[PDB]
Structure formats: C-alpha cells, structure tokens
Amino acid sequence: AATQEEIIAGLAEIIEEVTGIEPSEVTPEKSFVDDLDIDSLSMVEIAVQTEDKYGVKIPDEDLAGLRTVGDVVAYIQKLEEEN
Amino acid sequence: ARPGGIAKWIRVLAVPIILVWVAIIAVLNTVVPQLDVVGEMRSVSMSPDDAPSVIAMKRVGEVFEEFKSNSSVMIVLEGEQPLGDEAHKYYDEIVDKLEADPAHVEHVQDFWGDPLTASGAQSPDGLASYVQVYTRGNQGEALANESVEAVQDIVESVPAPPGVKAYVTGPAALSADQHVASDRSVRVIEALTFAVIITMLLLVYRSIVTVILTLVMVVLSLSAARGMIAFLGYHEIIGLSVFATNLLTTLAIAAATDYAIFLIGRYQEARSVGEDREQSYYTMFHSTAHVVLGSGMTIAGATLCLHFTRMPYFQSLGIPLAIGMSVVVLASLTMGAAIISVASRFGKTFEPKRAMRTRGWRKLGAAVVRWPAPILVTTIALSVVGLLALPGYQTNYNDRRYLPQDLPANTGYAAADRHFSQARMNPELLMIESDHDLRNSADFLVVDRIAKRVFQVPGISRVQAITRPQGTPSFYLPPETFENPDFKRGMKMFLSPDGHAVRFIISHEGDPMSPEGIKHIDAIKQAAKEAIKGTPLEGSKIYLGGTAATFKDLQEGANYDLIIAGIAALCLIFIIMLIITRAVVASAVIVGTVVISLGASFGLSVLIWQHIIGLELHWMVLAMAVIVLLAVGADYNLLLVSRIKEEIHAGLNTGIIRSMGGTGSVVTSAGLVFAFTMMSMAVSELAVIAQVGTTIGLGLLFDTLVIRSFMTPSIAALMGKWFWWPQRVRQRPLPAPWPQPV
Numbered sequence: 001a002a003t004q005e006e007i008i009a010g011l012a013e014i015i016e017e018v019t020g021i022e023p024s025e026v027t028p029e030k031s032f033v034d035d036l037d038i039d040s041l042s043m044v045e046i047a048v049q050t051e052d053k054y055g056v057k058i059p060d061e062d063l064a065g066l067r068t069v070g071d072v073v074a075y076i077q078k079l080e081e082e083n
Numbered sequence: 084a085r086p087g088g089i090a091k092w093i094r095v096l097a098v099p100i101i102l103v104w105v106a107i108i109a110v111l112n113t114v115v116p117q118l119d120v121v122g123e124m125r126s127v128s129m130s131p132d133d134a135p136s137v138i139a140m141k142r143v144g145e146v147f148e149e150f151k152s153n154s155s156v157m158i159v160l161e162g163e164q165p166l167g168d169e170a171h172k173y174y175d176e177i178v179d180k181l182e183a184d185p186a187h188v189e190h191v192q193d194f195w196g197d198p199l200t201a202s203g204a205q206s207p208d209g210l211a212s213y214v215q216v217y218t219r220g221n222q223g224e225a226l227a228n229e230s231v232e233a234v235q236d237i238v239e240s241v242p243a244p245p246g247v248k249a250y251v252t253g254p255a256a257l258s259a260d261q262h263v264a265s266d267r268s269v270r271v272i273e274a275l276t277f278a279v280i281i282t283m284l285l286l287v288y289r290s291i292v293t294v295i296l297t298l299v300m301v302v303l304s305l306s307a308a309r310g311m312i313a314f315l316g317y318h319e320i321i322g323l324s325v326f327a328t329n330l331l332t333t334l335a336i337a338a339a340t341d342y343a344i345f346l347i348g349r350y351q352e353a354r355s356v357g358e359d360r361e362q363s364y365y366t367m368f369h370s371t372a373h374v375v376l377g378s379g380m381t382i383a384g385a386t387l388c389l390h391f392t393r394m395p396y397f398q399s400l401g402i403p404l405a406i407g408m409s410v411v412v413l414a415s416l417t418m419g420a421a422i423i424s425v426a427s428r429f430g431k432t433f434e435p436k437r438a439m440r441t442r443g444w445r446k447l448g449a450a451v452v453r454w455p456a457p458i459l460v461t462t463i464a465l466s467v468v469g470l471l472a473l474p475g476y477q478t479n480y481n482d483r484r485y486l487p488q489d490l491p492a493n494t495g496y497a498a499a500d501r502h503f504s505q506a507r508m509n510p511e512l513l514m515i516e517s518d519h520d521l522r523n524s525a526d527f528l529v530v531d532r533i534a535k536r537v538f539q540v541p542g543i544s545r546v547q548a549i550t551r552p553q554g555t556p557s558f559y560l561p562p563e564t565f566e567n568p569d570f571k572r573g574m575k576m577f578l579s580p581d582g583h584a585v586r587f588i589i590s591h592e593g594d595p596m597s598p599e600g601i602k603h604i605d606a607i608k609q610a611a612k613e614a615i616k617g618t619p620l621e622g623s624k625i626y627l628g629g630t631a632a633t634f635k636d637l638q639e640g641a642n643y644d645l646i647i648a649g650i651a652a653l654c655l656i657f658i659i660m661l662i663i664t665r666a667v668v669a670s671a672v673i674v675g676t677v678v679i680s681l682g683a684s685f686g687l688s689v690l691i692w693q694h695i696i697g698l699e700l701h702w703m704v705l706a707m708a709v710i711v712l713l714a715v716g717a718d719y720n721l722l723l724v725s726r727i728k729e730e731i732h733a734g735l736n737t738g739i740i741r742s743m744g745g746t747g748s749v750v751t752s753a754g755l756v757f758a759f760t761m762m763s764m765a766v767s768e769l770a771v772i773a774q775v776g777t778t779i780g781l782g783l784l785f786d787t788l789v790i791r792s793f794m795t796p797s798i799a800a801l802m803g804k805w806f807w808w809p810q811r812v813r814q815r816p817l818p819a820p821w822p823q824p825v
Contacts (some may be wrong), residue, residue, distance in 0.1 A: 006821035013822065018445070023825065042442075045740060052734030055818025062451070063497035 001081040004028060005074050018042065028070035038074055040064075056080060084365035090372070090420075096363065097421035104418040108303055115317045119269055122328035123262055125316040127399035129223030131252070133638040137221065137719075139628030143512050146519045148585045150189035151215035153628070154227040154255040156234055159507050162247035163497040167207065169244040174212065176592050177249065180237045181216060184535045187230035187745035190217040197576065198392045199569050203553040206502035213499065216369075222633075223258040223395070231259035235491055241655040252508065252631050253493025257482055260490035263323045264768035269332070273703075276333060276763040280756060281341055286650060287752045288347070292432045297343045300422055304339035304414035305332065308407040315406060322399040329764070329772050330400065330707060336762035338382060338715075339588045340407060341753040342375050342415035345722065348749030351421055351435040360427035367423070372416055374725050377663040379412025381656045385714040388651040389706065392644035394637055396703060444747030448740035451793055452800040459797040462789050466679040469686020476689050479699035480596050480634050485770040506591035507545060511604070511629030513537070515613065516578075522574065522582040527560050530616050532587050536614035537589065542603050547588035549577040554590075591631065600631035603637060638702065652713045653678070660717065664724055666807040672798045673720040674713075680790040681712050684782025691781070692774055694734040700778075701771040708778040715757055715779075716786035719750050720795050727799060728807070734815045739796050747792070754787025758822025 012023035019038060026036075033039060038046070043066070047058035056076060066072045084090075089539055093100065115121065130137050130153070137153045144150035160166060161173055174195055182190045192215040193205035204212045216234060218227025235251045280301065284294040312331060316323040349371045353363035361415060383405040390401025426432040451458050483496050499508040515533065519527065531550040538546040538555075545554040552573060564570050578585050593599045608625050615621050653674055660670030688708070691701050726746045730738035761783065764776020799806050804814055 002821040005824040008825035010821045013264065019442070039446065041446045041449055044453045045445060048449060048452050048740065049737045052737035052815040056822075057813060 003078070004073065007076050008069070010054060011050075011069060011073065013048075014046060017049070018046060020027050026069055028068075028073055030069060032069060032071075034067070036069075041063075084362065084369040086361065086365055086822050088149040090365055090368035092814075093417060093420045094361075094424050097424040100421045101425070104303060104414060108306045108310060110824075111314055112306060113288060115310065118313045118328050118332065119266060121313045121316045122325050123228070123266065124225050125319070125323045126223060126228060126262065127322040127324045127327075127395040128221040129258055129395065130221070131393055131395055131398075131640075132221070132632070134640075135398055135626075136636050139246060139626035139632065140512065142624075142626050143514070143586070143628060144189070146516065146579050149578050149585065152189060152217065152218075152219050152221055152227070154218045154220055154224075154230065156216050156231055156251055156253040156256045157220055157493050157495065157499070157546045158207070158214045158216060158234075158238060159250045159252060159508070160247060161212075161250065161502065162210060164246050165209045166212055166247070170212070172592065173241065173244050173247060173249070174214065174336070175237055177243045178214070179557060184233060184237060186690075188216055189219050191215070192217075192576075194576075197569075197572060199573050200547075200552040200576070202804050203547055205235060208450050208502060209648065211498065211502035211743075213503065215510075215741055219272060221680070222255045226257040227255045228262055231256045241805065247321060247369070248498075250491065250495035250498050251497065252492045254509070254633075256495065257486070261482070261486055261769060264487055264490060265329055265772070266771075267569045268330065268768035270765065272767045273332065275766055276336055276775070279759045279763055280336070280502070283752070283756045284340075287344070287748075288436065290432075290436045290625065291349065292426075293436075295433060296422055296426055297347060299338065300338040300343045300415070300419045301336055301420060304342075304411050305335045307414045308339075310337040311410045312407045315403070316432050316729045321402045321406070322395065322775050323403055324396055324399040325769075326396060326703070326707075326772065327400050327403045327788050329767065329769065330711075331404055331776065333760060333776065334382070334404065334711065335407055335411045338378070339415060339468060339684050340760070341715075341718075341757050342378070342464045342582075342613045343419055344410065344749060344753040344756060345371050345375060346415070346419055346423060347433065348746070348752070349426075350433055352439060352745055352749070354433075354437055355435055355758045358496075360540045364420075364424055364427055368420060370725070370729055371722075372420070373414050373663060373801055374718075375412060376722050376723045377659055377725075378714075379408060380407040380414075380659045381717050381721070382711075382714035383412070384655040385652040385690045385710045388648045388655060389710060391651065392648055394644065397648070397706060399643060400707065402569060408636040438629055440748045441744040445740060447745035447747065447792065448743030448796060450480060451796045452736045452740050453741070455797040455801040457562075458793050459801060460792040462797065463679065464783065465789060466643050466794070467682035469683040469690075471691075472631040472689040474684045475693075475717065477699045478702045478705070479655065480598075480702060481594065481636065481699075482596075482701075483525065484531060484698055484770075484776075485701055488776055489770050502504070503570065504544060504590070506595040506600075508594065509630045510545075510547075511589040511591075511595070511627060511631055513589055513607065513625070514584045515611070515615055515620070515623035515626045516579075516584045518583075519618075519620075520582045521578055522565065524562065526559055529615065529620050532559050533611050533614040536610050537587065537607055540603070540606050540610050542592045542599055543589060543607065544592040545590035547590075549585060559588055565597040586780035587628070589627075595629075595631040595797040596634050598638075601635040602627055604632045604635045625803070639700050641706070645709070646708065649709055649713075652710055656713055656717050660721055660724075663721065664807075665727060666728075666810050668727075668802065668806050668808045669724050669799075672795060672802075673717050676720055676790055676794045676798070677713055677716040677786070678784045680716050680782060681709060681793070683785045683790075684708065684712055684778060688774070688778035688779045691777065698774070701774050704774040707775045708782065711761075711775075711779045712786070715754075715783055716790060719754055719786055719791045722746065722750060723791055723795055724799070727796075731812060735801055735806075735812070739799050743792075743796055750791055751787050753790065754783050758783040 387403035
C-alpha cells in the first residue's frame with residue numbers, strides 16, 4: 001500500500017500536467033478549488049487522468065464529496081489498501 | 084521526432100523547393116490565361132450529348148435541316164404601345180441581321196414574320212412578340228455563350244423604334260448570363276474571402292508576421308491550383324464549368340488555409356511544449372503531414388466521385404476539383420513546410436505570441452470522456468433534428484431566381500412574364516417521322532388528331548402545328564389546299580423539307596422547368612404514342628426535346644448520380660481513413676459522424692434558404708455540399724483521431740483528453756476559417772453558388788462546434804479498446820507505481 005508522500009507527489013505531478021501549480025503547493029492539510037482553483041469539471045479531468053495513468057477508480061458520486069487534496073488522497077488510500 | 088525521412092529532405096531543400104514552387108506559379112500563370120478567362124472560354128455543356136433531349140434536338144435540326152446544335156434563345160419584343168407595322172419592320176431587321184451572321188445563328192423561326200402564324204407569336208394583349216433563334220454550340224458551352232453574346236450585340240446594333248425594346252433571353256442566354264454574373268462576382272467573392280481569412284488569422288495568431296507568411300502560403304497554393312486547372316482547361320485536357328471555377332477557387336483557398344493552420348498550430352504547440360525549432364518542425368511534420376496527405380486524398384477523391392456522374396456540370400466539377408485540391412495539398416505539404424522551416428531560423432516569426440488555449444478544451448474533453456453516452460446522445464439528437472426539413476424540402480430548378488434580375492436573360496424573362504405565361508417562352512419541340520411522305524390528307528388528319536391529343540393533356544396550354552398555327556384555331560383538308568402558297572409556307576415551316584416529319588411547339592400551363600414539366604414530358608410522349616397508335620402512319624419516332632425534357636433527364640441523372648456519388652465518396656473516404664489510421668472502427672466512426680453532420684447541415688441550410696431567405700435550394704447544391712462536407716468534416720475528424728492515436732500511449736481516456744486539449748484550438752480555428760470562407764460565397768451573384776457556400780459553411784460550423792468537438796471523441800471514449808480495431812490497443816495502461824516524492 002502506497003503511503004502519503006508518494007501519492008501526494010503523483011497528484012502534484014498530475015496537477016503539473018493539468019494546470020502547472022508547483023508540486024510543493026499541494027499538501028494534505030490544504031483545501032481545493034476554494035483554495036487552489038481547479039474546477040469541478042477539471043476535477044473530472046483529474047479523476048479520469050488518475051484512473052488512466054495510475055489505475056485507480058474515482059466515481060462521480062464520491063467526486064463531489066472531495067473538497068481537499070487530503071480528502072482525495074484519503075479516498076485513494078481506502079480504495080487501494082482494500083486489496 | 085527522428086530527424087530523417089521526407090521531413091529532413093524538405094528541411095534541407097526548403098529554399099530550393101520554394102523557388103521551384105514559385106517558378107511553377109510563374110509558368111502556370113504566364114503561358115495560360117487566368118482561371119476565369121479559361122473557364123469562360125472552355126465552359127462545359129449544360130446537358131450530356133447522350134441525353135434524350137440533346138439527341139432529340141439534334142435530330143430536330145438534322146431532319147429539318149435548320150440547325151445542328153442544342154441551343155435556343157428567345158427574342159422578346161416588348162412595346163409600350165401595341166406592336167404595329169414599325170415593330171414588324173424592326174423585327175424583320177433583327178431577323179435579317181441574324182440571318183446575316185450564320186457563324187453564331189444557325190436558324191431563326193420566323194413565326195411573327197409570316198402572317199399565318201403571326202398571331203401565334205404575339206401576346207394575348209398584342210403588346211409583346213417573341214421569336215426563337217437556334218444558335219450554334221450546345222447550351223452552356225463556350226460556343227453557345229459567344230453565340231448568345233453575338234445575338235445580343237446584333238439585337239442592340241439595330242436601332243429600336245421609339246417605345247419598343249428587344250430583349251434576348253432563354254436557356255442558352257440564361258447560361259451566358261450566369262457566366263456573366265459569376266465574372267461580376269468573382270472579384271468581390273475573392274476580396275471577401277481574403278478579408279475573412281485575414282481577420283480570422285489576426286484573431287487567432289495575433290502576429291502580423293505569422294499571418295503574412297500564412298497568407299503567402301495560401302495565395303501561392305491557390306495560384307498553383309488555379310494555374311494547373313487553367314493549364315488543363317486551356318489545352319482541352321479536361322472540361323470546365325463556371326461552377327467548377329468558383330467552387331475550386333474557394334475550396335483551394337479554404338483548404339490551403341486549413342493546412343496552413345494545421346501545420347502552424349502543430350508547430351506552435353511543439354514550440355510551447357519546449358522543443359527547439361528543429362525538433363518542433365520535425366514533430367509537426369511527423370504528426371501532421373500524414374494528416375494533410377489524408378485530407379487531400381479525401382477531398383480529391385470526394386470530388387473525383389463526381390467525375391463518374393452523367394451530367395457535364397458534375398463531370399466538370401469532378402476532375403478539375405480533384406486536380407486542384409491535389410495541387411493545393413502538394414503545395415501545402417511541400418512549400419508550407421519549407422516556409423515554416425526557413426521562417427523558424429529567421430528570428431521569432433512562427434513562435435506563438437500567446438499561450439495556447441488548452442484548459443477550456445481539456446475541460447471539454449473531460450466532460451466528453453467521463454460521460455460519453457449523454458454527450459453522444461445529445462449530439463446525435465442535435466444533428467438528426469435537422470432531418471425535420473425533409474417533409475417540405477424543395478429542389479427548385481428555376482434558374483431565373485438564382486441569377487441577378489438585371490441580367491439580360493432575367494430582364495428578358497421579366498418582359499416575357501408581363502405579357503406571356505411563364506411556359507410560352509420555354510417551349511418544347513415534338514415530332515413524328517413517317518417512313519413515307521407526310522404531305523397527305525390522311526396524314527394531316529393524323530397530325531390534327533395528335534395535336535388535339537397533346538393539347539388535351541393536362542398542364543399543356545398552347546400547341547402549335549401545321550393544322551394549328553396558333554394556340555387554338557369532322558376535320559378535313561381538301562387537296563386544293565396543298566397548292567396554297569401560304570399553306571406551302573406553313574408546310575415548309577412546320578414539316579420536314581422532305582415531308583416526313585411534322586414539328587409541334589408545346590407550351591405548358593405552369594412552369595415547364597419545374598417538376599410539373601418533367602411529369603408533363605412523359606405524359607406528352609405517351610399521349611402522342613396512343614394518338615399515333617391505330618393509324619396508317621404508326622411506326623414513327625417521338626423525339627421530344629426542349630428545356631422541360633432536358634431538366635427531366637438532368638433530374639433523373641441528378642438523383643441517381645448523387646446517390647451513387649455519395650456512396651462512392653463514403654467508401655473512398657473510409658478507405659483513405661483506414662489507410663491512414665489502420666483502424667477500421669475509427670474510419671467508420673469518422674464516416675458516420677460526418678454523415679450525421681451532413682443531415683444537420685441539410686436541415687440548417689434548407690431551413691435558412693427555403694424559409695427565411697425565401698429562395699428554394701438548387702439541386703446541385705445538395706451534391707456539392709455533400710461532397711465538400713464528406714471531405715472537410717472527415718478531414719477534421721481524421722486530424723482529431725490521429726492526435727488521439729498519438730496520445731494513446733498514456734492511455735485511452737487520457738489520450739483522448741490530451742488530444743482534445745492539444746488540438747481543439749487548432750481544429751476550431753481551421754473549421755471556423757473554412758466555414759467562413761464558404762459563407763463568403765453568400766455575396767456571389769450566382770445564388771446557387773451562394774447556396775452551396777452557405778450550406779457548406781453551416782455544415783462545417785456544425786462539424787467543428789459539436790460534431791468534431793463532441794460526437795467523435797464521445798464515440799472514441801465510449802468504445803475504447805474496440806475504437807482501434809484491428810490494431811491491438813489496450814485500455815488504461817498498467818498501473819504505474821506512485822512516484823517517490825521529489
């Protein structure tokens with residue numbers, strides 16, 4: 001099971017590929033578009049890219065409930081470590 | 084991109100290949116006149132030589148020993164006061180002058196001069212008179228056009244009496260007038276297309292140097308196409324039509340600027356990523372040159388599918404467009420790539436002046452990919468709702484409304500309609516050829532019988548024959564009437580010189596050149612068939628010619644050839660897409676999306692033209708619009724699909740979304756430019772050309788806004804693994820481990 005730092009780094013790299021916000025900006029204690037300004041449709045973009053190139057599913061039902069990068073990384077953890 | 088191959092050769096030989104292309108431009112524009120001049124002087128006929136109407140009229144001329152060509156012009160004498168003896172003198176002078184010029188005038192039917200048929204030519208109110216002149220050359224040909232001009236000059240030369248004017252109209256005059264209108268409007272349409280392209284390129288690139296270089300690319304490519312086609316037409320290698328000239332100019336300029344936008348957008352995207360000039364140019368070539376080859380192949384083949392039709396307009400639209408577009412695409416791929424190469428070294432000419440817009444297109448691609456089914460259903464409905472225009476769509480053949488009303492033929496028709504019915508100035512020639520002599524009493528009883536039968540046909544207003552010199556005069560002709568000099572003159576004017584064929588002038592009730600005329604031609608033929616049936620003269624031929632039979636042949640050929648050419652264009656464009664992408668499913672998706680976009684384009688164009696413009700859609704507009712849409716929309720879909728295939732390496736969904744982000748601005752700019760260049764035909768005096776251009780422009784706006792943007796990527800994301808059959812492509816790749824933090 002991947003730990004905090006590598007998953008945060010992967011998300012930061014995908015943000016680079018998406019917008020370009022510097023990787024050290026992303027941190028599991030900060031917030032999302034009310035802080036770091038990536039839209040809900042661009043959450044859909046993040047989710048589809050991370051499903052493709054990282055092989056982890058993200059449902060649309062749980063996408064709206066993710067309002068921090070900490071929330072999405074926690075979702076990644078309790079979707080990955082369950083076999 | 085690997086620095087080698089054709090791209091390397093174009094890179095090193097950029098300046099020599101620019102010089103070679105410039106030399107080709109100079110040669111093609113210095114040894115052959117311009118496209119407009121050669122198109123005017125090498126215009127193709129209106130109807131095929133094998134058409135029943137053309138052979139019928141040629142048989143008319145051969146049997147009657149009057150003319151040898153299928154071209155008729157009416158000469159209408161409209162006077163404020165009733166046409167008196169001064170009008171008769173003026174008309175006789177016109178007839179004498181026409182007979183004095185046998186080079187362009189083959190025969191003149193002196194109906195008004197002879198008193199026996201004089202009242203036949205005059206209008207019911209006795210204010211206007213008309214005379215038929217059979218000129219030289221098949222209708223629509225350059226010979227027929229110059230014959231019409233000579234007839235007009237002859238008419239204008241004679242001093243008309245006060246209060247009386249003469250106009251030259253008719254089918255051949257209508258074709259000459261359409262050529263004149265196109266020559267009038269070509270300058271303004273070219274200026275409008277230049278202005279639109281300049282405006283769009285200023286909006287997109289925002290760089291003066293970039294737009295000047297792109298304009299040089301486009302102008303030199305268009306000059307190459309025009310010079311090649313003018314060289315072919317001048318040396319009689321291929322036929323040509325004014326439709327072909329106008330549509331070729333606009334398609335050449337629009338496709339050349341689309342290829343320019345494709346190459347410049349790819350180069351600028353590569354530069355924005357971070358690749359230097361060499362690597363950026365090589366990447367642009369390796370990712371867009373094959374796309375441009377494919378686009379040119381699709382356009383050339385789609386137009387070439389019209390070459391296998393029957394009518395000479397589509398025949399002269401097929402090969403010239405194919406050659407012109409092939410020249411445009413070769414000019415793009417060679418000289419535009421060379422220009423990009425040489426300008427890359429020169430400072431920062433082609434460096435993008437602003438950050439390329441990808442965030443919006445990337446979000447749109449996310450919306451497409453995540454929910455492909457709703458997007459696909461929405462765009463399918465939005466493109467099918469256009470098909471609601473079928474119950475009510477009309478395909479009027481009335482070329483009078485499609486030409487300016489100030490033209491000589493339109494003014495002649497306007498003068499005719501003020502005193503005659505719409506049909507009496509577009510009559511029909513009929514006869515029966517007896518194997519024996521036709522100057523017999525029983526033969527004239529049979530002639531009167533067939534005249535009465537054809538008059539009794541619904542929708543036929545006026546019939547003219549030896550027994551009926553006018554619209555309407557137990558019957559019996561005594562033998563002593565044979566020696567009447569007036570009757571002998573009527574015989575010579577109505578019977579064949581050997582006395583074996585009798586000609587009939589048929590005037591319809593409604594429009595002779597509307598579908599009513601087509602359903603009238605077969606009725607006339609069959610009715611004459613049973614009228615001659617059961618008679619001692621039975622066994623004759625029923626050659627019926629004129630404008631109505633001509634348009635009957637043209638409309639049946641148009642339906643069959645449009646269907647077969649659409650099917651051929653579908654198959655050929657699918658073959659080209661399969662050749663490029665090596666994916667049968669992707670090619671099928673491209674073709675299907677373009678077909679549904681065609682449905683939407685038909686709906687929108689029919690709506691606008693037939694409902695708010697008020698002018699019914701011309702028949703060839705459908706064929707040319709279908710061909711150009713299958714070309715250009717499939718080209719845009721091919722570019723998108725090729726970008727998707729390049730981006731697949733990171734995954735299917737992410738590949739589609741990255742491809743959309745990278746090419747959305749490029750493809751939407753190119754599609755907007757092409758659509759606006761096609762709508763630049765809206766100012767063409769040929770309202771048929773305006774209809775073609777508006778239809779194609781609206782169709783391509785639909786293609787780029789919703790079809791290419793939504794339908795194609797939605798289908799691609801919905802299919803996924805099977806979108807690239809038989810190429811074995813995986814789903815989202817193997818899950819990469821989460822990277823070690825930096």
